[PDB]
Structure formats: structure tokens, C-alpha cells
């Protein structure tokens, strides 16, 4: 269950999540867009899912892509803030899960976000340990898909 996934997150993992988010979460517009464009660059097969945002190659100049990228970072902000209460993390994770379930996004496809995250983290010198911490948070969402 999603609860099992959340309840598993340990103190050391929450620590790494919080420490890395302090940095990558401080520039939501910049890092959010970088996350999205990196996803499009390495997984071109996903572009079709974002037709609403228009031309995603426009990057920062694309207002729709900019608005989406910022809202995504607040969804992650929401997750980070709920870390100490599995009950709250679960209901927010499930809320956002529905947003992707309606778009027919499977658990496997959602996990494609791990690559971009690993790269953004690296650009700030957060190594594999931190990428693994984030893969665990992503897995919580996957448990709901």
C-alpha cells in the first residue's frame, strides 16, 4: 500500500530529502523548468502527453510550461512538508496520483522522472545517495499508480 511505502521512509532518508530540497527547492522556477526540459530531452516519447503546454522547446519563454513547472515544484514542496506524518503524506500523494491516473500515466512512466531528478541534483553536487533518497519518495507515488 501507499501507507507501507510512506511509513518506510526512514530518518536518514527524510534528512537527505530535506537537505537537498533546501537547495533545489529554493529556485522553483529555475529548477522546475530544468526538470521538465530534461525529461523532454531524455524521454522524447513523453512530449505528446504535454500538448496543452504547447511548444515545450520554448523553455522558460513558454508561459504555460513555466506555470506548470512552478506548480510541480509546489507539489514536491507539499510532499517534503508532509514527511513526518505518513497519514498526511498519503492523502496528498493520492490526490496528485489521481491527476496522473486520469492522464493514463502508469507507475513505470512516472518513474521516468528519476533520471531528470538525478541530473538536477547533480548540477548542485548532490550525489547518488541523494538520488536514491528521491527515488524512494517517487516510489511512494508509484505505489498509488
Ranges within 16-55 binding ligand HEM (CB under 6 A): 46, 49-50, 52
- Does position 119 bind ligand HEM by CB under 6 A? no
- Does position 23 bind a copy of itself by CB under 8 A? no
DSSP 3-state of 106: coil
Which residue do the cell numbers 531528478 mark? 117
Nearest approach, Cβ of residue 33 and a copy of itself (Å):
11
- Does position 107 bind ligand HEM by CB under 6 A? no
String of DSSP letters for 67-85? HHHHHHHHHHHHHHHTTT-
DSSP 3-state of 39: helix
Contacted entry of a copy of itself, ligand HEM, none for residue 91, CB cut-off 5 to 8 Å set by kind: a copy of itself
- Does position 103 bind ligand HEM by CB under 6 A? yes
Check if the beta carbon of residue 94 is closer than 8 Å to that of residue 144: yes
Amino acid at each position: 500500500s501507499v501507507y507501507d511505502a510512506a511509513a518506510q521512509l526512514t530518518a536518514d532518508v527524510k534528512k537527505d530529502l530535506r537537505d537537498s530540497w533546501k537547495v533545489i527547492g529554493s529556485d522553483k522556477k529555475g529548477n522546475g523548468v530544468a526538470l521538465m526540459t530534461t525529461l523532454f530531452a531524455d524521454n522524447q516519447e513523453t512530449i505528446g502527453y504535454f500538448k496543452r503546454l504547447g511548444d515545450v522547446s520554448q523553455g522558460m519563454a513558454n508561459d504555460k510550461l513555466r506555470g506548470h513547472s512552478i506548480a510541480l515544484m509546489y507539489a514536491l514542496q507539499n510532499f517534503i512538508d508532509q514527511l513526518d506524518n505518513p497519514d498526511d503524506l498519503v492523502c496528498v500523494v493520492e490526490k496528485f496520483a489521481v491527476n496522473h491516473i486520469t492522464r493514463k500515466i502508469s507507475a513505470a512512466e512516472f518513474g521516468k522522472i528519476n533520471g531528470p531528478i538525478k541530473k538536477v541534483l547533480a548540477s548542485k553536487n548532490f550525489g547518488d545517495k541523494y538520488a536514491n533518497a528521491w527515488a524512494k519518495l517517487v516510489a511512494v507515488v508509484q505505489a498509488a499508480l
